[PDB]
């Protein structure tokens, strides 16, 4: 079997990617935020405290023919922003590929952030089942569930920058790429898609050859990366300089940016430094928010979206897993 369904951007920053999930029978169509930095599928529901609900869609398993209760099951889970529950299993389909017996978990509560983004119904998590947080009894990801059925056992994340793009399981569609694909090892040992990026350079200056350790995480907006590189980064950007009180790195909103490359073994990403620019720190200000930033004090680096979107990545879950990178 394969599926195929569609990503979009919440907002024109492309702050996070929604894909639309079929739960249940008949089917309650969930807007869910595909993240391969954790490993649970959970929801808002009928069960969810109703001051904690703003406009979300919600799933109800009472008008599910196929929902049951995994009894004793609860569920809690942190990102600042955190949401707890109890479990079902029942039916889940992403663009055409089904699994049945998913665990779909209900949340009870959500922390304000959630409740304040109206456009995310939930997230389906894609790192390995190892991080799954459904106590007492451990449950498996949609991926890990579908996997055996899988023509292969793969899914591609093709992220658009400020517009649409696409999630495939079980497929690589070579005509969504250019050139080749590389593909790298990957660590499971913290339950990422963890790999290790070969180096990287700013703009048209000389690659930096240099051992980067990082999660490929389609659920983090950003690009996190050592000190050292987000200050080189930043250094090519007049007026660029690390705010303490806003949070990050903000540059005038009048600059250009240059890109930024990073390495696959011996190929090379470039991300165009439009991709870079999250707009106004608050509405109406000169000031913008950096889209690379530095990792320390996170304890892992990241290559959030903006790094993914300007790749076509494959996620290789074969019984030693690999991510694969093409330029497209
Ligand atoms: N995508 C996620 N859910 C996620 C959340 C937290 C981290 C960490 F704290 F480890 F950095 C990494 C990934």
């Known amino acids: 079997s394969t599926g195929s369904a569609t990503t ?77 529950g109890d479990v079902y299993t029942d039916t889940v389909s992403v663009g055409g590929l089904t699994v049945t017996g998913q665990a779909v978990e209900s949340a009870k509560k959500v922390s304000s952030s959630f409740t304040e983004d109206s456009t995310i119904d939930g997230l389906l998590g894609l790192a390995f089942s190892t991080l799954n947080t459904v106590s007492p009894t451990q449950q498996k990801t949609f991926f890990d569930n579908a996997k055996a059925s899988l023509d292969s056992p793969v899914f591609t994340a093709d992220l658009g920058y400020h517009a649409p793009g696409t999630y495939n399981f079980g497929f690589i569609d070579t005509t969504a790429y250019t050139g080749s694909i590389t593909y790298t090892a990957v660590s499971t040992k913290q339950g ?103 990792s320390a004090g996170i304890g892992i680096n990241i290559f959030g979206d903006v790094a993914l979107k300007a790749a076509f990545v494959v996620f290789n879950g074969a019984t030693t897993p690999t991510l694969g990178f093409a330029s497209k």
């Open 192 to 294: 990422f898609w963890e790999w290790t990026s070969t180096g990287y350079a700013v703009g048209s200056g000389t690659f930096k050859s240099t051992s980067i350790d990082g999660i490929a995480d389609t659920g983090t907006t950003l690009l996190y990366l050592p000190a050292t590189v987000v200050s080189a980064y930043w250094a090519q950007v007049s007026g660029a300089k690390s705010s303490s009180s806003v949070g990050g790195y903000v540059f005038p909103c009048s600059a250009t940016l240059p890109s930024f490359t990073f390495g696959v073994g011996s190929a090379r990403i470039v991300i165009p430094g439009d991709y870079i620019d999250f707009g106004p720190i608050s509405t109406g200000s000169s000031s913008c928010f950096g889209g690379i930033q530095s």
């Open 8 to 84: 979009t951007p919440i907002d024109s920053l492309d702050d996070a990617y929604i894909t639309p999930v079929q739960i249940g029978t008949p089917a309650q169509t969930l807007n869910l935020d595909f993240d391969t930095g954790s490993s649970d599928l959970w929801v808002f529901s009928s069960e969810t405290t109703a001051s904690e609900v703003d406009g979300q869609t919600i799933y109800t398993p009472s008008k599910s023919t196929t929902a049951k209760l995994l009894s004793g099951a609860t569920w809690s889970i942190s990102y600042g922003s955190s949401s707890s």
